[PDB]
């Protein structure tokens, strides 16, 4: 039960590193939705030269 307790603690600590590395990549998807708003700033720039 202590070899087993050393196993499931390591697997849960590895899963804890997942759940906080996923969130720092969810905070990266919140930047890819700004690379969207910059690709729409290129739509608005080609629409500025359109309108002008």
């Amino acid at each position: 039960a202590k070899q087993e307790s050393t196993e499931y603690r390591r697997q849960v600590q590895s899963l804890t590193c997942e759940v906080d590395a996923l969130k720092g990549t969810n905070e990266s998807l919140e930047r890819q939705m700004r690379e969207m708003e910059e690709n729409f700033a290129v739509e608005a720039a080609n629409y500025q030269d359109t309108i002008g």
């Binding site: 080609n46 629409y47 030269d49 359109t50």
Partner: peptide, 8 residues
């Protein structure tokens, strides 16, 4: 950029 060329 095609609406620029087309509407010009």
């Amino acid at each position: 950029r095609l609406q620029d060329e087309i509407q010009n």
